[PDB]
């Protein structure tokens, strides 16, 4: 779930505020349209897409989906137990985690006009 999410953030790029990531670019803070602005823009591209595709399963909805997960000394791990949606939605979470923690932060691209930009 986002609760978890914004958890795995704060667990990959404790140097930021979780909040930095959640209005960025055409991607970063909701679901997504337009071209991808630079290299978070991206990780945020497939995170939404990875959304999208854990939608496929009955019942699984990503933004709600509690799933087990842990955190510690600079490690995300989806652990077992998850089912098919849970452990689908952690790892679109995690990898997207571990982009943002690899990818440069632009200033410029927080907040960015969505209906002009994002087309």
């Known amino acids: 779930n986002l609760y978890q999410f914004k958890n795995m953030i704060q667990?990959?790029?404790?140097?930021?505020?979780w909040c930095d990531f959640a209005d960025y670019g055409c991607y970063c803070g909701k679901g997504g349209s337009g071209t991808p602005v630079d290299d978070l823009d991206r990780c945020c591209q497939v995170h939404d897409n990875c959304y999208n595709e854990a939608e496929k399963i009955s019942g699984c909805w990503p933004y709600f989906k509690t799933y087990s997960y842990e955190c510690s000394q600079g490690t995300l791990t989806c652990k077992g137990g998850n089912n098919a949606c849970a452990a689908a939605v952690c790892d679109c979470d995690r990898?997207?985690?571990?982009?943002?923690?690899?990818?440069?932060?632009?200033?410029?691209?927080?907040?960015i006009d969505l209906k002009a930009r994002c087309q």
Not at 11 to 17: A, E, H, K, Y
Not at 97 to 110: H, K, L, Q, S, V
């Open 11 to 17: 667990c990959t790029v404790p140097s930021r505020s």
């Open 95 to 111: 990898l997207a985690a571990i982009c943002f923690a690899g990818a440069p932060y632009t200033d410029a691209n927080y907040n």
